[PDB]
Amino acid sequence: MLYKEPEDGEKIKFDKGKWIVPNKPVILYIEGDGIGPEITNAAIKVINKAVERAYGSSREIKWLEVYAGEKAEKLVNDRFPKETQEMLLKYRVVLKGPLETPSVNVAIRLMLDLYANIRPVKYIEGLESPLKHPEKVDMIIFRENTDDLYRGIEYPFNSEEAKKIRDFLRKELKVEIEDDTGIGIKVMSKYKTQRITRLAIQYAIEHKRKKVTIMHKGNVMKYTEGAFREWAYEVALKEYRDFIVTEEEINQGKPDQGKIILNDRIADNMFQQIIIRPEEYDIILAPNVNGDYISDAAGALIGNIGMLGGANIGDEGGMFEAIHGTAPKYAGKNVANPTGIIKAGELMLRWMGWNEAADLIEKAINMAIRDKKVTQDIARFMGVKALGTKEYADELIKIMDTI
Amino acid sequence: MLYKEPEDGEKIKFDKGKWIVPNKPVILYIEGDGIGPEITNAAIKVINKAVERAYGSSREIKWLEVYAGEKAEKLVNDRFPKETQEMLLKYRVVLKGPLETPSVNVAIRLMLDLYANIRPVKYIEGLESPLKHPEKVDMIIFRENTDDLYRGIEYPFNSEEAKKIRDFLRKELKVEIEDDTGIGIKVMSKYKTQRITRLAIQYAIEHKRKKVTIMHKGNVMKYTEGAFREWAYEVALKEYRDFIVTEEEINQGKPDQGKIILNDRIADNMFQQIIIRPEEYDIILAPNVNGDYISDAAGALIGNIGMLGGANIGDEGGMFEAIHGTAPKYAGKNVANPTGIIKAGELMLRWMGWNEAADLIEKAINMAIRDKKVTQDIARFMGVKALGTKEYADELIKIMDTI
């Protein structure tokens, strides 16, 4: 056996995806390549303090390190070892550092069935920002991570498969396509749409969020994006009636918006409104391609994209990770910024229901940034001495001990 | 006919996609609805002044008004009269105000085959921006205006049409797809991509630009977007070899960057870049949906969206318009801002090869705004009393009389 499960631990469980967490949950973690070992072990240190300072031994994460990537290769000769997979299907929750793409990330998502990609982007107190007023950006994107025309159903223009489709459409649908065309089949799932809409509303109800906007270009693509918006509304009302209110209803004769507001906006002006009035958005729900575009812009609203964390949640499991590469160039030098992976840890806490410790990490970070206790990649523009990876983590801990 | 054609004017003979303009070109214009009359006449006033001040009496535009929209409904009982169509097919270039939708915008695009949507976006001076440093924003977006999912080949998840498609992909392509699936076929034309790339390059050459970047998601949609990139690169290197240089070429030795530079970038991260350092973009080339989204993100950079102008160009014709609605609320109150349509008139001047006239207008607008001589939409945010629609155009005219 490679691993030795913590006998004082207990698997996190799921009921209708409610995610029920024990006082001593076993959580997996993969160091990752490059800077991973450093930012991740630093993350695990700040989270434990955030847990003990908020619950004081009444709760404690029993970490279990599994191997994947170059560590697994340089030790067991398998970049993704069977024992590692068995621990993943059993414990179902991993905080994983960055891993090169020499696939492991896809493998994990597939085997745990993580369909929803979550990207929370809120401004942190004293960071540089391309915006003049970023101090209002507090949104979280919910992306259905295997649904748009990312499924892969496409063919080169000079392929016979493409010829088959062109012949088909021409006589079976009376649709005429030229020969010099590349063809892709965009597919929009009803089930997939409903599954992610549930997660979005659920999350809003658990963390008492107020607005849930649907990003869509359903005015032009009626049966894919348009269908998405329709279904989203359908299941939101057929299943969470007592919790939400359509924008069309408060803007009507049955107001009282003291609960979740489900509304929608065409995707065209979306890119405008996030750059000029980011406060207009809270929780954004959209298909796979939109979410890939909207989120990158989102994170641009507030510089230091590598200080954000994300997640991949499924009906029963989750994977959390910083949103940056392995930076093999700064590996083992105690220079890298561990904020990105610590922020994934925070998100992992929120999902866990442990909002008190999540909130501590957030406050600790905000404090340190405005107090100039930062790693070199930020202090460069904050003209002050840079703190190392371990030191930055310790400053957070040292701060956390004095709320 | 009801249109008395200028007998001292000549047709613009764009033969090679280059636009061969006489000294007295005949140009059609449509006032438009709501604020159409006011803002369009103002535009015509300032444009004739720029022409005259730059070329004296050696050149003069021979304006010819054609009816469309609600004006044509009152005068001719036809939203888009056949006579108006004869003039469009004959003179082929129009400056048109905004028009409601009970559309003629799409009809003109169709009958003149204007496949290219051009959107130049550049900062002004005293204009508020949501960006801290919007100064080095001088973009121009070249969008293929009828090429992908916008062609309309989609079907709802419960259509017999969709059933035929789901059957085909199964028995003939052997691809697995659920039944609760909306379907859209993304098409990408090798021909369409080449014609718009030519326009793009042809524009950089004639207007001393120096960078054409290809926006695409060729990393997940290789056979459509990826094909777009491949084909764009092909026609460039094959038909404009002596005018351009790929990114990969300069760094791989022999520089010669004294010619237009051509490169590409993935679209996901492109949306972050336009926000943190938009100066990195000159001419952006992209497919239909991408450019539809990249266009709003940019432009949302400078904020005053209604002060932007755009064009729809074909191999031999052109439509120029402000990028804003008809604002029925401000109709006939001399309050609407005419800058947008004027900017369209500016882009029109440029395409005609009359850069002197174009530069006058541009400098004039910058001087009026830095000197706070603006309409209500802008005065409201910069302390002084607004100028009316007429008065503002008059100020520009006196300004051009000085420079």
PDB file of C-alpha atoms in Angstrom, chain B residues 9 38 54 89 91 117 123 143 162 242-243 255 259 262 270 292-293 295 307 309 311 322 328 372 384 392:
ATOM      1  CA  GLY B   9     -22.137  63.262 -59.098  1.00  0.00           C
ATOM      2  CA  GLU B  38     -31.058  65.292 -36.094  1.00  0.00           C
ATOM      3  CA  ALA B  54      -9.299  69.492 -46.512  1.00  0.00           C
ATOM      4  CA  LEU B  89     -27.892  48.624 -55.866  1.00  0.00           C
ATOM      5  CA  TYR B  91     -24.728  53.809 -55.781  1.00  0.00           C
ATOM      6  CA  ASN B 117     -18.509  44.112 -40.046  1.00  0.00           C
ATOM      7  CA  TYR B 123     -10.187  56.375 -26.803  1.00  0.00           C
ATOM      8  CA  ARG B 143     -15.632  40.515 -38.019  1.00  0.00           C
ATOM      9  CA  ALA B 162     -33.399  17.151 -34.775  1.00  0.00           C
ATOM     10  CA  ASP B 242       5.665  41.220 -49.472  1.00  0.00           C
ATOM     11  CA  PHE B 243       3.554  43.121 -46.918  1.00  0.00           C
ATOM     12  CA  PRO B 255      13.170  40.220 -38.778  1.00  0.00           C
ATOM     13  CA  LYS B 259       6.045  45.376 -42.771  1.00  0.00           C
ATOM     14  CA  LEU B 262       0.534  38.998 -38.357  1.00  0.00           C
ATOM     15  CA  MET B 270      -7.805  37.248 -25.302  1.00  0.00           C
ATOM     16  CA  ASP B 292     -19.571  39.434 -31.806  1.00  0.00           C
ATOM     17  CA  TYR B 293     -18.383  39.003 -28.234  1.00  0.00           C
ATOM     18  CA  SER B 295     -16.664  43.725 -30.042  1.00  0.00           C
ATOM     19  CA  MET B 307     -20.042  57.560 -29.632  1.00  0.00           C
ATOM     20  CA  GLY B 309     -19.121  54.137 -35.360  1.00  0.00           C
ATOM     21  CA  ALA B 311     -19.320  49.792 -41.035  1.00  0.00           C
ATOM     22  CA  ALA B 322     -23.454  54.693 -35.435  1.00  0.00           C
ATOM     23  CA  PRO B 328     -37.102  57.619 -29.256  1.00  0.00           C
ATOM     24  CA  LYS B 372     -15.717  70.396 -22.610  1.00  0.00           C
ATOM     25  CA  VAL B 384     -20.315  71.881 -17.389  1.00  0.00           C
ATOM     26  CA  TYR B 392     -22.256  70.673 -30.836  1.00  0.00           C
TER      27      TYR B 392
END
